[PDB]
Amino acid sequence: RTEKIYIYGASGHGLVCEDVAKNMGYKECIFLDDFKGMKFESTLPKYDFFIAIGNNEIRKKIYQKISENGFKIVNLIHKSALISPSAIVEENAGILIMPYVVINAKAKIEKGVILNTSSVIEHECVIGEFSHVSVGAKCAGNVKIGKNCFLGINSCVLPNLSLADDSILGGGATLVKNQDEKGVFVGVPAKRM
Amino acid sequence: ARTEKIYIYGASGHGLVCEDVAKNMGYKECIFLDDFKGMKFESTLPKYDFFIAIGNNEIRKKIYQKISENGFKIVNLIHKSALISPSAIVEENAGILIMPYVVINAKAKIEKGVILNTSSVIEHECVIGEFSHVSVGAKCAGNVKIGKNCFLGINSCVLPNLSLADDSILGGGATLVKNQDEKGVFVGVPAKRM
Amino acid sequence: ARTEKIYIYGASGHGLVCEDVAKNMGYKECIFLDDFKGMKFESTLPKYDFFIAIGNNEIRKKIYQKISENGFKIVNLIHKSALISPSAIVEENAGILIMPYVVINAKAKIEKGVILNTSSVIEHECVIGEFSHVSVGAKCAGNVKIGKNCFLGINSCVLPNLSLADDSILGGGATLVKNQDEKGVFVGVPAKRM
Numbered sequence: 405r406t407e408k409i410y411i412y413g414a415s416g417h418g419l420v421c422e423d424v425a426k427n428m429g430y431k432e433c434i435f436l437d438d439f440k441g442m443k444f445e446s447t448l449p450k451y452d453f454f455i456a457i458g459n460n461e462i463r464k465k466i467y468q469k470i471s472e473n474g475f476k477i478v479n480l481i482h483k484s485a486l487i488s489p490s491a492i493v494e495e496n497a498g499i500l501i502m503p504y505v506v507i508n509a510k511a512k513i514e515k516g517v518i519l520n521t522s523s524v525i526e527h528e529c530v531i532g533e534f535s536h537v538s539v540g541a542k543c544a545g546n547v548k549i550g551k552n553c554f555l556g557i558n559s560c561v562l563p564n565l566s567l568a569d570d571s572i573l574g575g576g577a578t579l580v581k582n583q584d585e586k587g588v589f590v591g592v593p594a595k596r597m
Numbered sequence: 598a599r600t601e602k603i604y605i606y607g608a609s610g611h612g613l614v615c616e617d618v619a620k621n622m623g624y625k626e627c628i629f630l631d632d633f634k635g636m637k638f639e640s641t642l643p644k645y646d647f648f649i650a651i652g653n654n655e656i657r658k659k660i661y662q663k664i665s666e667n668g669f670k671i672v673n674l675i676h677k678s679a680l681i682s683p684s685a686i687v688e689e690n691a692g693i694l695i696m697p698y699v700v701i702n703a704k705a706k707i708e709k710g711v712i713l714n715t716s717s718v719i720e721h722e723c724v725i726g727e728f729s730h731v732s733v734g735a736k737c738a739g740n741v742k743i744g745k746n747c748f749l750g751i752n753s754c755v756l757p758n759l760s761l762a763d764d765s766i767l768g769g770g771a772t773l774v775k776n777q778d779e780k781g782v783f784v785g786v787p788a789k790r791m
Numbered sequence: 792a793r794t795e796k797i798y799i800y801g802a803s804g805h806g807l808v809c810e811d812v813a814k815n816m817g818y819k820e821c822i823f824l825d826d827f828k829g830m831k832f833e834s835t836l837p838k839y840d841f842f843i844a845i846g847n848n849e850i851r852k853k854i855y856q857k858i859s860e861n862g863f864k865i866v867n868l869i870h871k872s873a874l875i876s877p878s879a880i881v882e883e884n885a886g887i888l889i890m891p892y893v894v895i896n897a898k899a900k901i902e903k904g905v906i907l908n909t910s911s912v913i914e915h916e917c918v919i920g921e922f923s924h925v926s927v928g929a930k931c932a933g934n935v936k937i938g939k940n941c942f943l944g945i946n947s948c949v950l951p952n953l954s955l956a957d958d959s960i961l962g963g964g965a966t967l968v969k970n971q972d973e974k975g976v977f978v979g980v981p982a983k984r985m
């Protein structure tokens with residue numbers, strides 16, 4: 405790791421990422437935000453980089469842009485996250501792992517994923533690239549979450565289920581059936597909106 | 598700074614868990630006070646640190662007031678496993694309970710007399726109003742405003758940018774998806790006025 | 792005479808997570824057993840500690856009985872990050888699984904063969920009946936009595952002072968708000984008999 409880190413995103417999401425970065429031992433966070441702070445330039449000095457954008461589509465776009473412009477996009481992983489030695493977390497892939505997250509045996513976390521505070525990824529899950537597993541959201545064993553999915557605060561998915569790319573599981577929702585097409589699912593049990 | 602002994606007002610279940618937190622913090626001895634079930638509070642007691650171990654928000658506030666008005670220091674009991682952002686604000690010596698594995702993120706503010714129960718989460722920029730109770734596993738998303746004397750039940754949650762009126766109850770397992778500026782009892786997914 | 796090896800009965804996903812707990816506790820070698828050629832339980836297996844990593848409550852109980860009756864020790868696998876009150880009672884050498892970041896508060900009792908899965912919470916004074924399974928993130932409020940062989944689904948919860956009949960299922964995401972002394976399957980917020 406370098407001593408400094410760029411945090412793209414001047415917002416509460418950025419601040420939380422900065423806290424994780426400090427936890428990992430980064431000495432200084434340099435914020436950039438083209439809307440809300442200091443504008444990025446492709447001629448900035450090369451330090452470790454992180455994309456603290458909550459929106460999955462925007463995060464992917466900026467990830468591609470920054471990754472093209474030469475920067476290494478590290479993972480920010482809080483020291484209190486518990487990760488099985490047999491779990492797979494893509495290295496240097498802009499993944500955020502917040503405090504008290506647990507990732508169990510043989511689960512796979514793809515690039516650009518957010519695992520937010522106290523979320524749980526059970527054994528043998530696959531969490532697709534640029535997905536956001538929100539605060540307290542829990543995936544049971546063998547759950548496959550598609551690319552760019554959003555699992556809302558305190559939501560959950562029962563074992564052996566799949567959620568299609570680009571889907572939203574609402575805050576508090578309990579998914580009890582496979583979903584092979586994109587949707588927005590809310591309620592206990594979760595149903596299409 | 599902390600005294601060797603602490604008086605815990607509340608000889609109950611809530612009292613037992615507070616005692617565990619106090620021991621976690623390093624207190625050597627906990628002395629229970631309870632006006633109905635054991636040793637009585639008296640204004641003449643030595644000035645040891647105090648805590649109000651009463652779950653009921655209204656009663657906790659009444660007792661907090663009585664104790665503080667008698668010149669006793671009501672400390673915070675904060676489990677060592679709680680993770681608190683350096684930019685979060687937790688009111689000092691304000692009878693706040695922070696249970697194990699609680700997380701409080703950047704710029705969140707926790708006011709006097711609040712309970713943050715086991716494994717609750719207070720996300721960035723929240724304000725948790727005085728004498729509120731955020732129950733076990735209850736989670737507030739970013740920029741949530743919880744009113745004074747509110748009660749968020751077990752495993753409940755509030756979506757981002759929302760406000761809950763003073764003196765409201767969010768039921769166990771409830772998911773608040775809309776602002777509520779009129780107090781009430783809200784239950785279900787999504788949370789509806791009862 | 793160093794204790795290094797453990798048999799884990801159940802070569803499944805549940806087996807893998809049990810192995811990670813055992814290795815967290817400092818076991819060096821995990822020997823999986825299951826009903827497949829070359830790895831079956833046998834009466835004359837060399838004696839090492841056992842654990843039964845079977846999620847199904849009824850089968851777990853049956854295998855527990857068999858291994859126990861062969862004079863073997865069925866240990867508890869308890870992750871070091873679990874927080875257990877000094878006044879809580881967890882039955883010793885009783886095949887109990889306690890996963891990462893579980894909290895068990897003052898005076899709660901955990902009976903033999905129980906599973907407390909990742910990030911579950913057992914509040915003060917609960918009684919969790921033998922061979923019950925409290926799933927990932929499921930939370931029992933204070934003084935809750937869970938019957939034998941119960942299953943509390945992912946992110947379910949039970950409100951304070953409630954009792955759940957032996958052999959019941961609380962569905963994933965369900966919030967139990969009333970006593971159930973007749974067994975059944977209870978789903979939704981609030982939980983209703985299926």
Ligand SMILES: CC(=O)SCCNC(=O)CCNC(=O)[C@@H](O)C(C)(C)COP(=O)(O)OP(=O)(O)OC[C@@H]1O[C@@H](n2cnc3c(N)ncnc32)[C@H](O)[C@@H]1OP(=O)(O)O
Pocket residue numbers: 520537538539555556557572573574575576577588589590591597720738739756757772774786787
């Ligand atoms: C910082 C972190 O990472 S943690 C928190 C992160 N964020 C979240 O969890 C937010 C997740 N988003 C949501 O839950 C949802 O509001 C969404 C995406 C399901 C729906 O969004 P929108 O379509 O904008 O819904 P909107 O607020 O306009 O409400 C339409 C409604 O559907 C209902 N509804 C909205 N969200 C939910 C929900 N989570 N559960 C149940 N019902 C819901 C509303 O009650 C309203 O119903 P009505 O027609 O009776 O008025």
Ligand SMILES: CC(=O)SCCNC(=O)CCNC(=O)[C@@H](O)C(C)(C)COP(=O)(O)OP(=O)(O)OC[C@@H]1O[C@@H](n2cnc3c(N)ncnc32)[C@H](O)[C@@H]1OP(=O)(O)O
Pocket residue numbers: 714731732733749750751766767768769770771782783784785914932933950951966968980981
């Ligand atoms: C130690 C800790 O911090 S963790 C645990 C802390 N404590 C809690 O979480 C308890 C929170 N309390 C509750 O959720 C609720 O029972 C309250 C406050 C919303 C309502 O309490 P009461 O008014 O006494 O409700 P009561 O039990 O009489 O039930 C009336 C009911 O509304 C329903 N109901 C009660 N609570 C809920 C709930 N949380 N969600 C959905 N429905 C509910 C009941 O099923 C019954 O409906 P019915 O008319 O169909 O029979």
Ligand SMILES: CC(=O)SCCNC(=O)CCNC(=O)[C@H](O)C(C)(C)COP(=O)(O)OP(=O)(O)OC[C@H]1O[C@@H](n2cnc3c(N)ncnc32)[C@H](O)[C@@H]1OP(=O)(O)O
Pocket residue numbers: 526544545562563578580592593908925926927943944945960961962963964965976977978979
């Ligand atoms: C590793 C861990 O320990 S974490 C994961 C642990 N495992 C779990 O949490 C699984 C818990 N199991 C469940 O919740 C269940 O689905 C049960 C036991 C409630 C029901 O199981 P089944 O009877 O097989 O339900 P099935 O999937 O056939 O669905 C029957 C229906 O009830 C509904 N349903 C199923 N589960 C639930 C639930 N948890 N909440 C609300 N409704 C539900 C379905 O939507 C369907 O309704 P429909 O008639 O409109 O189609």
